[PDB]
Design a protein around this ligand. Structure first.
Ligand SMILES: *[C@@H]1O[C@H](CO)[C@@H](O)[C@H](O)[C@H]1NC(C)=O
Ligand SMILES: *[C@@H]1O[C@H](CO)[C@@H](O)[C@H](O)[C@H]1NC(C)=O
Ligand SMILES: *[C@@H]1O[C@H](CO)[C@@H](O)[C@H](O)[C@H]1NC(C)=O
Length: 344
C-alpha cells in the first residue's frame, strides 16, 4: 500500500548528513508511524518531524556510510512493520573531489566568478565554499563544477580552497587561489566617443589580466550604460564605448563630459567612477541622402588630435576606401557605420 515516488537528491557524500527528501503515497499518518522505519540500505536515515508531510513526504538525515561495504542502496520505508515501501531507484554514496579552479587568480577586493571543477560536486543537500577561511558566495553547481563568487582577500598571495558538502570536507593543497593586487586605470585613448558609442578605446592600466571580463560603464542623462572589454595584457585592454543615446538629452557639438565614466572589474569598486577623467561624448554624425559624396556635419572631432571616427560605408556589404573631410565622405567603387552608429 505505501509507495515511494521520488528521492531527492539521488547522490550523497559517504560521510553522511544528506537531507534526503522522499516523496510518495501512503507514507504513514503521523510522524510516529515512520520515525524509526527509514533506512538507506544498512544506513539509518533519521526523519525530521518539522518537514514531515503526512502520507506524502519524509525528510530524513542520512547517517554515516564510511564503513558501508556498498556503493549504492535502495531506500526502505517501514510504516509502523509488514507494509513497507522500497524506493524505485537507488541512492548512490559518492566521494566528491575537485582538481581545478578557474580562474586561479583575482583581485584582492573579491567579486571574481570562479568555477571549481571536480567529480560528484552535485552530491548532498547543501554546499559551502571557503577561500582563506572566507565564504565564496555560492551561485550554482552540477556534477562537474561549482560556480561561486570570491570574497575579498586579507593579503595578496595563495589561499586554500575548502569545500563542505554535508559532513564531507573536501580539500586539495595543489588547488589554491592567488589573490592579486587590485588593477588600476591610468588613461583612455582616445579620450572621447560619439553618442551611439561602439568605438574602440585603448585603456591602459595595471594588473588588467587579473580580471577575466572587464566592462566599461558610463552614466549620462540619468541612465547607466555598459559595454564589453577584452584584455590584451596586464597593462593594455580594448573596450567599446558605451552608447549614451537617450531621449532626455544628447551631447552638444563641442562635447560634454558624461556624469560618470568608469569600469566594472569584479569588486574593485574604486574603478567604477573616474572622477578626474576628461572623457568627452560628441554627437553622432549627421548624414543625408563616378565618386559618391555623402555630405554632413559632426564628421570630424572639434578637437584635432591623433584620432578620428573610423568610418565604414558598407554599400554592397563591401567597404570602400574613403577620404573624410569636415563635410565629405567619398566612396570610389563601381550602410554607413561608425562604432555603434549606423545610417543610410
Ligand atoms: C600570484 O600571482 C603573481 C602575479 O600576479 C605571482 O607573481 C605570484 O607568484 C603568484 N602567487 C602564487 C602563490 O602563485
Ligand atoms: C601590452 O601590449 C601593448 C601593445 O603592443 C604594449 O604597448 C605594451 O607594452 C604591452 N605591455 C606589456 C606589459 O607587455
Ligand atoms: C576601421 O574599420 C575597418 C573596417 O572594419 C577596419 O578594417 C580597420 O581596422 C578599422 N581601423 C581602425 C583604426 O579601427
Amino acid at each position: 500500500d505505501p509507495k515511494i515516488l521520488k528521492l531527492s537528491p539521488e547522490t550523497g557524500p559517504r560521510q553522511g548528513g544528506t537531507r534526503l527528501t522522499i516523496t510518495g503515497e501512503n507514507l504513514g499518518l503521523r510522524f510516529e508511524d515512520v520515525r524509526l522505519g527509514v533506512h538507506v540500505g544498512k544506513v539509518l536515515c533519521s526523519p525530521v518531524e518539522s518537514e514531515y508531510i503526512s502520507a506524502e513526504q519524509i525528510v530524513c538525515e542520512i547517517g554515516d556510510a564510511s564503513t558501508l561495504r556498498a556503493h549504492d542502496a535502495l531506500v526502505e520505508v517501514c510504516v509502523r512493520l509488514h507494509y513497507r515501501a522500497l524506493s524505485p531507484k537507488r541512492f548512490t554514496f559518492v566521494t566528491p573531489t575537485f582538481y581545478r579552479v578557474s580562474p586561479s587568480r583575482g583581485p584582492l577586493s573579491g567579486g571574481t566568478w570562479i568555477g571549481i571543477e571536480g567529480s560528484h560536486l552535485n552530491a548532498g543537500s547543501d554546499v559551502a565554499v571557503s577561500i582563506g577561511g572566507r565564504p565564496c558566495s555560492f551561485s550554482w553547481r552540477n556534477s562537474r563544477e561549482i560556480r561561486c563568487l570570491t570574497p575579498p582577500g586579507h593579503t595578496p598571495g595563495s589561499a586554500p580552497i575548502v569545500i563542505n558538502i554535508n559532513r564531507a570536507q573536501l580539500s586539495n593543497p595543489e588547488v589554491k587561489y592567488n589573490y592579486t593586487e587590485d588593477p588600476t586605470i591610468l588613461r583612455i585613448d582616445p579620450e572621447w566617443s560619439i553618442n551611439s558609442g561602439g568605438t574602440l578605446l585603448t585603456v591602459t592600466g595595471t594588473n588588467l589580466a587579473t580580471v577575466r571580463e572587464p566592462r566599461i560603464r558610463a552614466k549620462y542623462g540619468g541612465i547607466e550604460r555598459e559595454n564589453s572589454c577584452m584584455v590584451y595584457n596586464d597593462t593594455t585592454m580594448v573596450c567599446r564605448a558605451p552608447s549614451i543615446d537617450n531621449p532626455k538629452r544628447s551631447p552638444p557639438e563641442l562635447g560634454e563630459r558624461p556624469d560618470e565614466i568608469g569600469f566594472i572589474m569584479d569588486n574593485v569598486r574604486t574603478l567604477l567612477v573616474l572622477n578626474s577623467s576628461s572623457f568627452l561624448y560628441y554627437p553622432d554624425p549627421v548624414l543625408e541622402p563616378s565618386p559618391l559624396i555623402l555630405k554632413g556635419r559632426n564628421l570630424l572631432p572639434p578637437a584635432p588630435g591623433n584620432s578620428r571616427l573610423n568610418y565604414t560605408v558598407l554599400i554592397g556589404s563591401t567597404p570602400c576606401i574613403l577620404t573624410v573631410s569636415e563635410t565629405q565622405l567619398l566612396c570610389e567603387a563601381p550602410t554607413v557605420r561608425a562604432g555603434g552608429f549606423e545610417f543610410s
